[PDB]
Symmetry: none
Subunit: 223 residues, 2 copies
């Protein structure tokens, strides 16, 4: 079967970290992995040719390994779009897998990618997580605490999130627009459909670069 | 009724941020609120005179407003010690409140302190909080996901945690040693005892300085 990387890049990913755009750092981490067929990057339609320029400029040796495609309005629409681009490259079979990952998580390691791929063999999906270190409070109303979850069972969700392309299409396709609005996480869709989602070990350093503070942390990390 | 600040300081709080220790930064924000009767600081037994010298050196003008006392083995014992220090200073009424706050959260704002005091009026306790940024995943088994709760209902706990001194003492005194181990922060005690704890709005800039990089970030903010 095939294994693809699905890079969600639909913004800080076009910003330089060190001497290369964040997006490039992230794609770089996937190019060495021998078991990856293509690296499929979902970008906002207006930034597709820009993303292609970056590949030409920063990763010319890996041009043919990388497919830039139009992402969607939310992450799951981008995943679907990625899977469609994959299907257009080589018609999907039930066993073909996509390793989905945030563009702004440049500190992913081969160990994480490899664990995700390995876990996907015997499970429906894989979610990369770390132990939650934040104290988490629940409030449905946003006015008072409706409860405090048992912290012993809480994890901070990261990416990759890994699953069979066909499996994601089938489950996502079964959702109403209203359900898609609520079930914004790909693993959540598998979980609520009663599927087996294994935990993969993330890393505290697997930072998501969202805010200008995250950017500062990222810069300090590359030394 | 009196309003007190209860600063939990026991180790980054004694490290310099700009030109002053972080602890002094944190104390200063509470001095900005005129309605605070005393700022009570719980530190490690051996660090009391050190913290006193810090107050003398950096806030001599405000030293009368600050009490340094010996904190405890966990944050809840330190809160207990703080409240006993308050009671030693001025006998408690059932309505005196304590605004408890991490020493290593020096970017607390006046607004946050004010909201905590206001919200404590009509509630059992107050938890200062921000909307959760990460997707939280639950696994009761450590192997597969048992739930991914809706992130829109989830909040990252910060401090201040504010409540009436007597109320804390009453609830805390009713716990066994094992409960006290699981009920690790004040608001958790309140919630499990079926009390009403209001959310106060925190800030994403209300950084808890735990790690070396937190300190680096704090420095860049100042
Ligand atoms: Ca097809
Ligand atoms: Ca609607």
């Amino acid at each position: 079967h095939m294994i693809y990387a699905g890079i969600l890049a639909g913004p800080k990913q076009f910003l330089e970290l060190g001497d290369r755009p964040i997006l490039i750092h992230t794609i770089e981490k996937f190019v060495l992995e021998p078991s990856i067929e293509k690296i499929v990057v979902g970008v906002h339609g207006d930034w597709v040719s820009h993303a292609e320029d970056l590949v030409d400029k920063y990763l010319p040796l890996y041009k043919e390994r990388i497919i830039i495609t139009k992402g969607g309005a939310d992450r799951n629409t981008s995943i679907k779009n990625i899977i469609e681009a994959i299907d257009a490259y080589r018609p999907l079979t039930p066993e073909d897998i996509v390793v989905t990952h945030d563009s702004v998580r440049p500190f992913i390691t081969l160990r994480m990618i490899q664990d995700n791929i390995q876990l996907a063999q015997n499970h429906d999906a894989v979610d990369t997580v770390v132990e939650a270190v934040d104290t988490i409070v629940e409030s449905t109303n946003g006015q008072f605490i409706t409860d405090i979850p048992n912290r012993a069972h809480l994890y901070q969700g990261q990416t990759p999130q890994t699953f069979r392309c066909k499996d994601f299409m089938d489950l996502y396709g079964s959702l109403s627009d209203e359900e898609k609005e609520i079930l914004t996480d790909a693993c959540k869709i598998f979980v609520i459909k009663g599927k087996d989602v294994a935990l993969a070990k993330g890393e505290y350093s697997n930072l998501k670069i969202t805010t200008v503070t995250d950017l500062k942390i990222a810069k300090s990390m590359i030394e």
